[PDB]
């Protein structure tokens, strides 16, 4: 019947953005609906409430170097009333333990959070050079109002 009025977003990484994790909505199977905006690479919350927040990144390397590789993926919240950047969800992986075959490290982050109107959300990594885009659906960021 009547379509959903729930604020939602599902944005995907730009495979040809050099040295960055750039989010896009103008792609097949990506979206912004019911007031969610994508501004300065951040998802902007249109109304207060409970939201599921999620992101996936996929890292890939060919063997292990001598300099220690640390991979991080973090979802942050910038609340309009506080004007502060706070981690909501974060993970750190060390793909190489003993040093030198291609390795793969997916990092999926998800949770339920109380958000405020105007909050800004970012999903970031430290190593965009290790991102893999072999297939579609491997690198994404989204929110769903409950």
Ligand X SMILES: C[C@@H](Nc1c(Cl)cnc2ccc(-c3cnc(C(C)(C)O)nc3)cc12)c1ccccc1F
Stretch that binds a second copy, among 14-22, 42-50, 122-130 (CB under 8 A): 42-50
Within 110-129, which residues bind a second copy (CB under 8 A)? 110-114
Task: Note whether 5 binds a second copy by CB under 8 A.
Answer: yes
Encoded tokens for 94: 């060390």
Phi, psi dihedral angles at 120 (to 5 degrees): -115, 135
Q: Tokens 């490290």 correspond to what residue?
A: 105
Q: Of residues 20, 26, 68, 126, which one binds a second copy by CB under 8 A?
A: 68
The H or E element containing residue 53 is strand 49-62
Q: How far is the CB of 41 from a second copy (least distance, A)?
A: 18
Tell me which residues touch ligand X (CB under 6 A).
6, 52, 54, 56, 108-112, 144, 146
19 binds, among a second copy, ligand X, none (CB under 5 to 8 A by kind): none
45 exposed, middle or buried (CB, 10 Å; 0-12, 13-18, 19+)? buried
């Amino acid at each position: 019947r009547t379509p959903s009025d729930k604020p939602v977003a599902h944005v995907v990484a730009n495979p040809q953005a050099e040295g960055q994790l750039q989010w896009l909505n103008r792609r097949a199977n990506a979206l912004l609906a019911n007031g969610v905006e994508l501004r300065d690479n951040q998802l902007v919350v249109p109304s207060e409430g409970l939201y599921l927040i999620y992101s996936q990144v996929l890292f890939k390397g060919q063997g292990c170097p001598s300099t220690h590789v640390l991979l991080t993926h973090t979802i942050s919240r910038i609340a309009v009333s506080y004007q502060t950047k706070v981690n909501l969800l974060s993970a750190i992986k060390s793909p190489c333990q003993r040093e030198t075959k291609p390795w793969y490290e997916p990092i999926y982050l998800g949770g339920v959070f109380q958000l405020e109107k105007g909050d800004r959300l970012s999903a970031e990594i430290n190593r965009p050079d290790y991102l893999d885009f072999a297939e579609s659906g491997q690198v994404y960021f989204g929110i769903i109002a409950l």
